[PDB]
Amino acid sequence: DAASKHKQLSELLR
Amino acid sequence: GSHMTADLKSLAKRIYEAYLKNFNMNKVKARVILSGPPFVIHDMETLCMAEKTLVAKEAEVRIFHCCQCTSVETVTELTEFAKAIPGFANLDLNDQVTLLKYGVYEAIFAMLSSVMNKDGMLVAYGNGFITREFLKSLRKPFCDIMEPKFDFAMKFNALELDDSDISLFVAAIICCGDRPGLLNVGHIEKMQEGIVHVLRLHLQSNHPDDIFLFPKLLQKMADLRQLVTEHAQLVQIIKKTESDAALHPLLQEIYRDMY
Ligand SMILES: CCCCCCCCCCCCCCCC(=O)O
Numbered sequence: 001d002a003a004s005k006h007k008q009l010s011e012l013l014r
Numbered sequence: 015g016s017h018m019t020a021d022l023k024s025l026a027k028r029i030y031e032a033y034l035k036n037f038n039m040n041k042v043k044a045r046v047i048l049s050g051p052p053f054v055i056h057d058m059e060t061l062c063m064a065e066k067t068l069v070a071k072e073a074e075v076r077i078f079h080c081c082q083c084t085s086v087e088t089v090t091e092l093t094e095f096a097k098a099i100p101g102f103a104n105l106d107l108n109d110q111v112t113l114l115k116y117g118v119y120e121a122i123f124a125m126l127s128s129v130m131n132k133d134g135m136l137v138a139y140g141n142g143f144i145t146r147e148f149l150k151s152l153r154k155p156f157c158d159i160m161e162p163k164f165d166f167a168m169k170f171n172a173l174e175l176d177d178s179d180i181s182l183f184v185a186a187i188i189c190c191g192d193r194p195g196l197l198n199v200g201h202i203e204k205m206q207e208g209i210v211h212v213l214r215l216h217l218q219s220n221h222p223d224d225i226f227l228f229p230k231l232l233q234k235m236a237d238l239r240q241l242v243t244e245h246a247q248l249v250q251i252i253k254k255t256e257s258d259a260a261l262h263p264l265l266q267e268i269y270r271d272m273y
Binding site: 007 | 108111264267268270
């Protein structure tokens, strides 16, 4: 799961 | 007693506006500065001076730390730019993450060309100019980080793109169905085709003297993918073998399992 492997990038995209 | 619709502005113009809104540096701004007063970093002493009065270990490690900070700022700019690309934020969160993961460094080295000439590059929000030779003079493995980006930029800058062209090029880089691990590959391919169609048309209007400019830019996208593969290899060597060269967590995420 890309989103969980990329938590800071994930946060930037919310 | 009727309902008239919005407009809208052309997609090329809306992407150009999203690019001007979201990036601190652009080619107009950098060329203003590079023509003429940025403080020149060309040796160890000028580096210590620029550092003292501009950014508040071993010299190579501080230049690499400054390299990362720049990348993090730009990654954040690219993420906001991405969200202004129609269709992007309607993608699965996982697919947005994946498109940015593979695309940010291709976009970063593409836009880096705007702040580079044959002698050096603007740094520190336009307030410093670090010379290409100084960068070449650092000890291994740090002496070869930047030179391949200069080589790409000299040829990219020879295309004479403006910010309206680069914004679409960057958009096509981000909205890319090629990336590994996409699930909704069909939707993203349609988004990419739409972006690339507007890029193709824009280059015809904006660069009618250069009828191969579109195939030239397709090649540059493949050159960028290779440049980033080699960069990430070089970055892995540095992390592995330089204990001071700690990596910012956002960047580790991006490189982690990339190529
Ligand atoms: C004041 C000190 C000057 C600092 C000079 C650093 C300028 C770096 C600009 C672009 C660096 C490219 C990013 C490579 C690092 C990475 O994110 O993997």
